[PDB]
Design a protein around this ligand. Sequence first.
Ligand code: ZN
Ligand code: ZN
Lengths: 416, 418
Amino acid sequence: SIGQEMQMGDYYVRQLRGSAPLINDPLLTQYINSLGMRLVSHANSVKTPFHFFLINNDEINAFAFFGGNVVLHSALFRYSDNESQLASVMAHEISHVTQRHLARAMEDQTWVGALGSILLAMASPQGMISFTQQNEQEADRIGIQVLQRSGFDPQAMPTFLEKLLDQARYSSRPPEILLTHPLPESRLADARNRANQMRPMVVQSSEDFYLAKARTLGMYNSGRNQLTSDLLDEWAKGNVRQQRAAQYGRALQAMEANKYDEARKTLQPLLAAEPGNAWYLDLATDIDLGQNKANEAINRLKNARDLRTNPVLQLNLANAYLQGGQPQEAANILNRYTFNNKDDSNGWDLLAQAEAALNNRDQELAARAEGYALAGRLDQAISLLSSASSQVKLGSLQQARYDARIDQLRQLQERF
Amino acid sequence: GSIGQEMQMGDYYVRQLRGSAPLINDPLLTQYINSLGMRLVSHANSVKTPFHFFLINNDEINAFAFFGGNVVLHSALFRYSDNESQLASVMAHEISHVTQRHLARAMEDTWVGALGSILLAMASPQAGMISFTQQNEQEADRIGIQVLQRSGFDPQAMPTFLEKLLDQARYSSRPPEILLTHPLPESRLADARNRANQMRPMVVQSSEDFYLAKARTLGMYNSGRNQLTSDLLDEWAKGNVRQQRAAQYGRALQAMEANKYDEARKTLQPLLAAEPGNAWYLDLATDIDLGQNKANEAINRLKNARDLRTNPVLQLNLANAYLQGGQPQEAANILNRYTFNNKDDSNGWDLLAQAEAALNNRDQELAARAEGYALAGRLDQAISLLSSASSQVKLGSLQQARYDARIDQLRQLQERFK
Ligand SMILES: [Zn+2]
Ligand SMILES: [Zn+2]
């Protein structure tokens, strides 16, 4: 049924988090899910919630499985020249889910672990899923309709397809994206026709896209996924959005190289123009904490317009409280945060740090258990909660909470 | 008014003392010395003024007093005092100098500053000097021994303490400074021994606060001859069990002074387990806790204290714990009420300045540190801080009216004396 594949989707996500190199950056996962949910917002026959994961892998690839869980390799940011092309890849994956392509592929079939090991191998940088040409024809047709309803450029799908074919037509070994997603000339030709058949729409990539590209290529450096100064030199001559993102990108690398004084005055003009922008506020806290100016980072975030609504600002201020020697205030935010974002391991780890500083050990063990549960290590999480349940009085409310959560984790184990 | 003049003349000298002499401003020690002193004053005859008792970080033994019931005791008194009744006899002796107005009556025969310069030279480790007539010293011993007795102390402690001063006046090349302000001829002694012999025999035990005060004074405020010796600590390890808890307390202090915090925490544990509610070990229990950045643990323990509403030592200890814990507002809630209930306590104002600074309430920070400067006799500097405070608030506001009013008060204190 649908309840099992949502539950089986959680299982694959948990072991993905436990061993694949997922990017857990607040701004990046917030952007990619915001953009992804915007596309789900205009998709048909959606029977599941949707979540979008970002993987630090310089090999371009994209795939999805049960429970509406979409996996995107970080290399997609360097291949996507505009926001509509990146969305073109997501709408393709989203359609793979609503059509239940992999689901029916696994209805004709130790079987869950066999696919879990395959999904894990596709995600890690170092037996692979492939879709039939019929599935891929449907995924482009329905995908381009989701993409037009979402207010992007329908022509971005064929230009992207032609971009990758023009680069991989001759290669002995094409990129992994074309093994999971076979792109013959026939599929490209049909993609270009349906794009030609609808209306022309020239859309500007959102500001958030260009800075997501800069941060992805900037902070999550690795291998071919460096942001060469070639792209930053080019963005310095581009449109008003690409020049700001260019200077944000080098303020980012200045902070990466501990050039904190250089980073502040480099980020200087952008923060003055948009003092309530999360990307600029996030980077400003990194620079302030790197120079042991925790108070200055706290006061800026406390005056932030949407601190009370934006999860990126809450995490930044909670961490600044910690570095500022105010664990209690950090815990007050993180206790609210971890219940508003139960699956966010950043919240759970920071709460564990706050509870350690406060010497509330059973609450620290409880927070540490969530990080282990989300990473698929259920036995270890059960172990921590058993310790937490042993440090509270028998018959106490807290003991009933820990014992009840152990039951949930234990029951989650017996399903697999 | 003579009593009015004497009380503000005393306040002027007390403010000069705070600003230049090395006073011990520790809550536990000042509360003990004044609790012991007030217990003597409450049994003294013809007390016409309040009394305050001050402690100097000075290894030279001396004691003296002046107008307004202000008596000054050097920390060396804990080195010479074998029992609480001996220390009480010195304070009873000095209390009687005030009630008899000896220093006041001696001065009826530039002059306000001439006496103040003498007072600080005797208190400072950098030593004119006042002296009383041996008639005056007889009245102080005669009246002091009766205050000593009505207060429940050993009257034989006074001659016993006088004789220990004489055995160092010839078995040592240095006459202890106390014997020069308070001269001790054998007649003075034989008169004292006779009176004590004619009162009731009384064997009294030193309070447990005395040994802890003696340990903290010599251990934490060690200076020169004022040491907490291993010979005395091991001697206290054999005496009554009060001295053993005090001896354990002293090594916990020195283990903390040398930043051996876990060694100190583990030494202090058995005394805290027996007496979980007394301020002495509670005070250091937080001190070691914050030495390891465990401020929450110090806070939780002090919120569970019985007498937090009544004991200033507990109130400051928790306010300081809130500050190190990163909750300055909870510290300010305590300190705003604390400073109002103890306006002459500079520890309270300094902590309020810290709390208001951490809250970025700059005008209130300046006003809090203004009180510290006013208590230290730095009235020009206090006025400067309140001038800055008044310049950061709108005119016509009450903050401005209140800051400017406080400046007016400090100016009156200023013009009363040159
Ligand atoms: Zn596909
Ligand atoms: Zn005398």
